[PDB]
Amino acid sequence: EVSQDLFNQFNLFAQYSAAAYCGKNNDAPAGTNITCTGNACPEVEKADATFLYSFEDSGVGDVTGFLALDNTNKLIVLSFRGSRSIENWIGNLNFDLKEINDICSGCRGHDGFTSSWRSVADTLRQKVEDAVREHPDYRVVFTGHSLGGALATVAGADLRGNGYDIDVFSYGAPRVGNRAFAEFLTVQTGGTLYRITHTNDIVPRLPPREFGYSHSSPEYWIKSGTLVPVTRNDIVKIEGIDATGGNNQPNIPDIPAHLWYFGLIGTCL
Amino acid sequence: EVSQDLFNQFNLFAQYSAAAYCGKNNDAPAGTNITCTGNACPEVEKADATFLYSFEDSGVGDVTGFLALDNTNKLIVLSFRGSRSIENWIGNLNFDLKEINDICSGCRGHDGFTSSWRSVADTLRQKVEDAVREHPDYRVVFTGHSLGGALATVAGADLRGNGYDIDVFSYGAPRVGNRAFAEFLTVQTGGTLYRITHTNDIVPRLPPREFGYSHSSPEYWIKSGTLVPVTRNDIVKIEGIDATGGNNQPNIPDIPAHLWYFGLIGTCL
Numbered sequence A, B: 001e002v003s004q005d006l007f008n009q010f011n012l013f014a015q016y017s018a019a020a021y022c023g024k025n026n027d028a029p030a031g032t033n034i035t036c037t038g039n040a041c042p043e044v045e046k047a048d049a050t051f052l053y054s055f056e057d058s059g060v061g062d063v064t065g066f067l068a069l070d071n072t073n074k075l076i077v078l079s080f081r082g083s084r085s086i087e088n089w090i091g092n093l094n095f096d097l098k099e100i101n102d103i104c105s106g107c108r109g110h111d112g113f114t115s116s117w118r119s120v121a122d123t124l125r126q127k128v129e130d131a132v133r134e135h136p137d138y139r140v141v142f143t144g145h146s147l148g149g150a151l152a153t154v155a156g157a158d159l160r161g162n163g164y165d166i167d168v169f170s171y172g173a174p175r176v177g178n179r180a181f182a183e184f185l186t187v188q189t190g191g192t193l194y195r196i197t198h199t200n201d202i203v204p205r206l207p208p209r210e211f212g213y214s215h216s217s218p219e220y221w222i223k224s225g226t227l228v229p230v231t232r233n234d235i236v237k238i239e240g241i242d243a244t245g246g247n248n249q250p251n252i253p254d255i256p257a258h259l260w261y262f263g264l265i266g267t268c269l
């Protein structure tokens, strides 16, 4: 169980995350209304939500996503898309750690996620700063599914401490580095990280703890099944760095579970 | 607002239809438990249901499907897979009629559907007749979604009146031939056709009336949205050959509404 208000937020950013895949913004001019194909993001459509900036295959890591202004909910949202071919991305995923002392001390992060962020960091930092100046009253939220969740998470840890809170909602995000990072993300100030997982979704189980990785705490574990609707009553907050008994069980994992976070995500009907 | 019992039947056969895509059918041993990936068919898994016979790319139209035995619900089910790539299949759909007096005099059917069925009929009847003999008390049901729905309806009309009722539950089915064929599907005894539709699904609107097609009556039209769970109250029975105000309405159609009959269908997570 989690609060209704938290549940509403989890649903909304799952949709903002779903929109990184299913919205029609390839080269949508800034100012367009955010809309999605196949009932992907109805809450988002319902808000006065427009694009601030849309990016695609950006930088070294082919980072894709968008920055949005939502006047209804008073948000600045930076949404990272995950892989366009998830199963592949999963089997092609290396486990290499890299030092990331310039974000936290003795921190080691995943090499590909930290790099891809690093390469787009300055352009996007700038773009959040602008929006924040233009709407000082709005909450800044970073969000993402899968790879997008990892990115989001790395970018929040990176850009916090600069005079505006950054909240992060990740959905099915992989592990992003070492126990020291997990600790940094557990305790850091200047915002909250909400790490959402589903059932036996495989992706938050990777890269393995046996490659030196750990999970930040806490974890919001969706227990309800794939293609089942989520209620506030189906989400358990799991406390403890690499707590087990949430998604971190030694049972057998699943890919489909990864594509159902409140609604269909990481794929478009 | 259809009955609870009818709703349960609707949901079950949607899943048997979904199972045609997401099962691990291929050709797996006869007498194997039927299971699907991605929670595509939990009600079927819950049944004591097994394959009797699976076909892949059989005959003229590469017909794909399975025949199943369901000892829990007392059914013999012939379920036909739709296309592997529905968007391409719709773009390539041919509108030609070919005569089918041997089904019903005056009748013209879609040429590709009728020819694909014609080409596997003998084998499939023999398989069905065999199962009827072994379980003479079980209800025979043909089912399918999309092109599968077409094949189930045709096989139906062709194979009824040989001593055993055949019910047909079809999900987002295209039209299957001329007004004469439509009429005949509307009246024929020894089994009931339940032709189910969703919102603005594109496939029940093809081929168009203009090319000389009609829809049998009645029509069960799910009005709840894509990715929204269906209740009894979201289904409306619609009377009259070529009646308008269920799926057959003058608005823009949608491919995603085609992929959501009670649950995900025509695609596999």
Ligand SMILES: *[C@@H]1O[C@H](CO)[C@@H](O)[C@H](O)[C@H]1NC(C)=O
Pocket (backbone or CB within 6 Å): A033, A046, A047, A048, A049
């Ligand atoms: C965009 O959204 C606003 C407010 O949410 C709306 O009133 C406006 O008409 C929309 N534009 C289009 C093209 O629909």
Ligand SMILES: *[C@@H]1O[C@H](CO)[C@@H](O)[C@H](O)[C@H]1NC(C)=O
Pocket (backbone or CB within 6 Å): B033, B045, B046, B047, B048, B049
């Ligand atoms: C198939 O499911 C039935 C119950 O519906 C069960 O008794 C049987 O053992 C299962 N078979 C396998 C191989 O899992």
